[PDB]
Design a protein around this ligand. Structure first.
Ligand SMILES: Nc1ncnc2c1ncn2[C@@H]1O[C@H](COP(=O)(O)OP(=O)(O)OP(=O)(O)O)[C@@H](O)[C@H]1O
Ligand SMILES: [Mg+2]
Length: 764
């Protein structure tokens, strides 16, 4: 208390000196907004305080500078360089709110930097440019609680934001102080859809529980019961503010589209339409579970980064409203009438009931009499009809297919619909999936479908390296904004920026900035620009223990002990994860959802497409196509089954093995001529037989892309030979052919007399 009072007394500004501290508590020109959770309001305060600065300070403009630090070791030269443009005399006497945001990524140097800036009032570098604090600029520092006698953070004035439960728990009565913010009185714009009030308090149907007319435009409740009605149907137990915001936004959009067409005053539409509003409210609150509830869990550090709601888990209802204002879109439930005058919702194919009494027999007959797209199954439908249906649901009225190779299953359609729905709501879309999981193909197909026929670049997929700094990300996002403005002006198209491998950088908080805050380096993103931003993350998975032991036992190992390595995601070294990813921002975890799992049928289809993309250059046979497809599929099956020598397999290995096979086939004539000459040079008699170029090329390509990098080569050969034609299915023959090829390749150099010809030198 003594330290807190000392710093409060020394941080106070005199009443006569004009300062920006007039908005903060009792004229203190130092602030610390902090909380233990993520996404609870730390920055709808530094915005509200700016909002209350303009109308309360009688100044034409009050400069706002947002400085965000993302380097794990906090760099003070960056902060000094950011503050230097605000050092000229013009800003030396005007109020300047300075907001400094320290991200979760930062770990070392926070306390020293805070003691250097807030207390020591200075910042200095080697060059000599000093920056001195003035008691006229607010210095609010927004920080996540670095929970581990007191931390070096309570000595400053603090405004602890609270999730939206502790607001309803501790603040039972709306005292509304400046230390514990509650429901913002401004935040009744999209949270005002308190139709929950009506269908809940009016439980019985006949009392006009949802009536024949409800709308929005003015408030009708108190800002302490909205937060309670949004907690009963939220689904999440202890939501943050950026978990109720998304749930309210989705419900607002869907009820807004509900009060659209087919919600009017016809003569004999159903003559009652009883329960239609009840159906909408109940069923879309049910389907909000897919869009609001987190998918990740609530090998120590990988526990939060472990998927629980995989795409193959509980189904997805996904009702849409066909923004052309004509019909609905029932895509994922196939409702079935219950025995006792009710109707329930089942799975797409299983038929298991997922929810009960969603909708009633009377309105069932009313809807079927209205010819709604109900009980339609996209699994067995023509491609033309499927594309027309999904194009109508998506909004564009055209029908030109942008591709034919890309199949359209029900699970692959409910995945495009998810992204489109999150785009039209406002929820940022971030997907978790392995390399070659089909996310990039789906995004490209959706972008081309949006394009239709225009030659516009509505896709800007950015492969984000491990060495992508903040400057590159900011430059790319502003370039994408400019291109989105251009495409919205010329051809009126919605551009898509795509950050592949989002979580593989030391600066990931920048992507969180771009996605959640809609703010680039501090400057807000231009609203209503048509730019939609997607992120894709690599899964958090550890190697198998035997594979780690094998990697450590390869040569001389790491130069020093394994434990002391600096590259750590918590405790696990980055050398033990399949993808060398970094820690996700805590305000991005609720958003992440599993893209899905590649199915064996889909994998076979992709392999068949790849091999058919080879005939036009090689003129392969049907037998050749079949043998190549089977060999490659079984090769990935083996590599995915061997967890000791191959952590993960990808579809991008077939497009490399087929490339090597193509090279070998195109050189096969001269290769086989030289091999025959070399064998003739040997003492072996004329035992050479016919060598099929297709087989002699696949036999050797799998001996490079799959076989010669393993340790259990014999098992691979014995599990792969059975897919070869009849006169060639021998593991001994596989090894013999590979050895003959290596012997031929080695012969052709002037190797010295006393140089060993091992199986290692030839292989190398
Ligand atoms: N009463 C409220 N207090 C705080 N936020 C609210 C409130 N009502 C609605 N919200 C919404 O909650 C969201 C919280 O987002 P905000 O930017 O405040 O999170 P944050 O504190 O910046 O978290 P982080 O810094 O970890 O991203 C805001 O975008 C705001 O629109
Ligand atoms: Mg923030």
């Amino acid at each position: 208390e003594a330290i807190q009072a000392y710093l409060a007394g020394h941080y106070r500004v005199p009443k006569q000196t004009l300062s920006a501290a007039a908005v903060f508590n009792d004229r203190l020109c130092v602030g610390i907004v902090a909380s233990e959770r993520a996404g609870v309001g730390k920055s709808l305060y530094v915005k509200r305080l700016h909002d209350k600065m303009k109308m309360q300070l009688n100044v034409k403009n009050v400069p706002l500078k947002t400085i965000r630090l993302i380097d794990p070791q906090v760099d003070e030269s960056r902060v000094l360089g950011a503050l230097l443009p605000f050092l000229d005399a013009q800003y030396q006497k005007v109020p300047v709110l300075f907001h400094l945001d320290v991200t979760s990524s930062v770990q070392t140097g926070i306390w020293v930097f805070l003691f250097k800036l807030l207390i020591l009032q200075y910042l200095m570098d080697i060059n000599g440019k000093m920056w001195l604090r003035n008691p006229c600029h607010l210095y609010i520092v927004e920080i996540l609680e670095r929970r581990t006698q007191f931390s070096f953070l309570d000595i400053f004035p603090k405004v602890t934001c609270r999730p939206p439960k502790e607001v309803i728990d501790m603040e039972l009565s709306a005292l509304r102080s400046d230390t514990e913010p509650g429901m913002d009185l401004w935040e009744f714009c999209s949270e005002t859809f308190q139709r929950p009030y009506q269908y809940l308090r009016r439980f019985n149907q006949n009392q006009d529980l949802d009536t024949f007319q409800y709308q929005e435009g003015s408030v009708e409740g108190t800002p302490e019961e909205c937060l309670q009605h949004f907690l009963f149907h939220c689904g999440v137990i202890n939501p943050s503010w950026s978990e109720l915001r998304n749930f309210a936004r989705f419900l607002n959009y869907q009820l807004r589209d509900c009060e659209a067409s087919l919600f009017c005053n016809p003569s004999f539409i159903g003559d009652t339409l009883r329960g239609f509003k009840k159906f909408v409210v109940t069923f879309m609150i049910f389907m909000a579970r897919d869009f609001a509830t987190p998918s990740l869990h609530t090998e120590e550090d990988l526990a939060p980064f472990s998927l629980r709601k995989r795409w193959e888990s509980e189904p997805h209802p996904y009702v849409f409203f066909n923004d052309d204002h004509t019909t609905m879109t029932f895509i994922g439930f196939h409702l079935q009438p219950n025995i006792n005058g009710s109707v329930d919702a089942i799975s797409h194919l299983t038929g298991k009931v997922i929810k009960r009494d969603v909708m009633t027999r009377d309105l069932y007959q009313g809807l079927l009499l209205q010819r709604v797209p109900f009980n339609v199954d996209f699994d067995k439908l023509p491609r033309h009809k499927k594309l027309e249906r999904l194009c109508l649901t998506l909004g564009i009225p055209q029908a030109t297919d942008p591709d034919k190779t890309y199949e359209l299953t029900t699970d692959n359609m409910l995945k495009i619909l998810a992204i489109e729905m999150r785009f039209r709501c406002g929820i940022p879309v971030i997907i978790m999936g392995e390399t070659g999981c089909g996310k990039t193909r789906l995004i490209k197909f959706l972008s081309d479908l949006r394009r239709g026929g225009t030659n516009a670049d509505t896709i800007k997929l950015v492969k984000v390296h491990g060495g992508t700094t903040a400057d590159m990300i900011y430059s790319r996002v502003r370039e994408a904004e400019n291109v989105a403005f251009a495409n919205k002006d010329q051809h009126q198209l919605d551009t898509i920026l795509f950050f592949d491998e989002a979580n593989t950088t030391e600066a990931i908080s920048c992507i969180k900035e771009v996605l959640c805050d809609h703010m680039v380096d501090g400057q807000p993103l231009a609203e209503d620009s048509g730019l939609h931003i997607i992120a894709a993350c690599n899964p958090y998975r550890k190697h198998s223990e035997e594979m780690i032991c094998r990697l450590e036992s390869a040569g001389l190992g790491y130069r020093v002990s394994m434990e002391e390595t600096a590259d750590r995601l918590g405790s696990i070294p980055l050398r033990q994860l399949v993808y060398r990813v970094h820690a996700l921002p805590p305000s991005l975890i609720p958003l992440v959802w599993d893209f899905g799992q590649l199915s064996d049928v889909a994998e076979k289809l992709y392999i068949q497409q790849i091999v058919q993309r080879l005939v036009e250059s090689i003129s392969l046979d049907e037998n050749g196509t079949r043998v190549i497809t089977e060999v490659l599929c079984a090769s990935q099956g083996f590599m995915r089954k061997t967890e000791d020598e191959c952590s993960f397999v990808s579809l991008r290995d077939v497009e490399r093995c087929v490339k090597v096979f193509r090279w070998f086939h195109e050189h096969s004539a001269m290769l086989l001529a030289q091999l025959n000459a070399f064998l003739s040079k040997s003492s072996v008699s004329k035992n050479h037989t016919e060598r099929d170029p297709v087989l002699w090329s696949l036999m050797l390509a799998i001996g490079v892309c799959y076989h010669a990098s393993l340790e259990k080569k014999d098992s691979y050969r014995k599990a792969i030979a059975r897919f070869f034609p009849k006169p060639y299915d021998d593991s001994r023959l596989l090894l013999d052919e590979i050895t003959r090829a290596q012997d031929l390749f080695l012969d052709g150099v002037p190797l010295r007399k006393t140089i060993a010809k091992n199986l290692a030198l030839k292989e190398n």
